[PDB]
Ligand binder design. Structure first.
Ligand code: HEM
Ligand SMILES: O=C(O)c1ccc(-n2ccnc2)cc1
Ligand SMILES: [Cl-]
Length: 393
């Protein structure tokens, strides 16, 4: 009764243009079986949301990539937060939620905004720039390593390490194999910066280590939670900001609306997260036989959630393939949903907001003026190169 499809959602052709295949996945049924990788798939909003919100049945501790940690050794020691289930998940999550809290956002917002304004001013002096290297990468690199408390030396490891982490959630294709082949120097740098003496006072890493005397985490858990932020906290924002700039470049009417009301910056970023869904996919593993969308899935089965597809599902969204900066975006799953819903989302939204505010106040037009090149990753969707001309306001 479950339809079987040969679509490979980790193939370069799929990454190059996922939208037709995502409609095929949605319209085939609420639950599909992907014969290429022997996993179940859910691509509609309803089933993605249901799976996210039943962590008991659809667990994370057997891994949120294709690999099942009950069958294979994880490529690195499991994350204490992303790859943990309640109750072990709960207190590390609470620590990261306090480290990346509103009060923290209040302490960093002015500096993050000043850096965003400064970057757009610098880019306007050049006029023609690459909105990936020169903006989507450069701006997070200018604020997030410092906010972590990292030293200057070795920061060139951070984007390659993150690319490895996000490729490693994928199946054992060439993208994953090559990433792991090149991993040893990046893992070495990252594991070393996770130690308490290497994290500057007041930054996110030091604050994690400071929580090790409350009973929520022990000192030996703090380095792995720092590792979580060094895995996730930079490349996600690169692709979120890149998505927002790409949306504004393709939809100039929405850039004009944003210029006319810069307080739409935060929602324009949120809509870009829905529209592009930089984090495309995550897996769960069933802990029992379960009925989902009328289908019966056995115990110990991997279930692939298409977050980007759920965010384009016309069963949930009006005009899903339109970028609309005043859309009611609440409920999109681009940050997940439920107990694992992105604990760094306030950092992501802060960066995206202040960059889009800088653009709204300083830029009159964003025109693609060179070849667009896509970046291929088993989990992240985004561009390698986005040549644009920025016209000043
Ligand atoms: C636009 C940017 C981002 C997007 C689209 C995004 C997406 C997501 C998603 C979909 C999840 C859910 C994972 C799951 O259900 O298995 C998640 C969780 C998480 N994110 Fe983000 N993220 C972003 C930025 C960040 C940032 C900036 C940080 C850190 C500063 C961060 C740290 C985390 C962590 C630690 C988790 C695990 C939370 C848990 O398992 O309880 N993320 N993110
Ligand atoms: O704990 C980890 O190692 C880890 C945690 C979170 C992500 N992630 C994905 C999207 N936002 C964050 C990636 C890795
Ligand atoms: Cl590592």
């Amino acid at each position: 009764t479950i339809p079987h499809l040969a679509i490979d959602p980790f193939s370069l052709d799929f990454f190059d243009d996922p939208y037709p295949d995502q409609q095929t996945l949605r319209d085939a049924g609420p639950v599909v079986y992907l014969d290429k990788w022997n996993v179940y798939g859910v691509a509609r909003y309803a089933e993605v949301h249901a799976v996210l919100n039943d962590p008991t049945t659809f667990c994370s501790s057997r891994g949120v990539g294709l690999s099942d940690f009950k069958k294979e050794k994880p490529w690195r020691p499991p994350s204490l937060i992303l790859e943990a289930d309640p109750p072990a998940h709960t207190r590390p999550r609470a620590v990261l939620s306090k480290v990346l809290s509103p009060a923290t956002m209040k302490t960093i917002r002015d500096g993050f905004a000043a850096a965003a304004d400064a970057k757009v001013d610098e880019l306007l002096q050049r006029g023609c720039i690459d909105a990936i290297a020169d903006l989507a990468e450069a701006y997070p690199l200018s604020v997030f390593p410092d906010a972590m408390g990292l030293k200057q030396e070795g920061r060139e490891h951070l984007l390659p390490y993150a690319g490895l982490v996000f490729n490693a959630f994928g199946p054992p294709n060439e993208l994953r194999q090559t990433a792991i082949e090149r991993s040893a120097p990046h893992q070495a740098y990252v594991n070393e910066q996770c130690q308490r003496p290497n994290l500057a006072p007041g930054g996110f890493g030091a604050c994690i280590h400071a929580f090790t005397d409350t009973g929520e985490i022990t000192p030996d858990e703090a380095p792995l939670l720092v590792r979580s932020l060094l895995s996730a906290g930079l490349d996600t924002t690169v692709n979120g900001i890149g998505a927002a700039v790409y949306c504004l470049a393709r939809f100039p009417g929405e850039l004009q609306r944003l210029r006319s009301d810069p307080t739409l910056a935060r929602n324009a970023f949120e809509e870009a997260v829905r529209f592009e869904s930089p984090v495309q996919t995550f897996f769960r593993t069933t802990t029992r036989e379960v009925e989902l969308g009328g289908a019966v899935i056995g115990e110990g089965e991997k279930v692939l959630m298409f977050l980007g597809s759920a965010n384009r599902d016309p069963r949930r969204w009006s005009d899903p393939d339109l970028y609309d900066i005043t859309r009611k975006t609440s409920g999109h799953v681009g940050f997940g949903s439920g107990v694992h819903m992105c604990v760094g989302q306030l950092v992501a939204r802060l960066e995206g907001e202040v960059m889009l505010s800088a653009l709204a106040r300083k830029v009159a037009a964003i025109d693609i003026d060179g070849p667009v090149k896509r970046r291929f990753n088993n989990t992240l969707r985004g561009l390698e190169s986005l040549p644009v001309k920025l016209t000043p306001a």
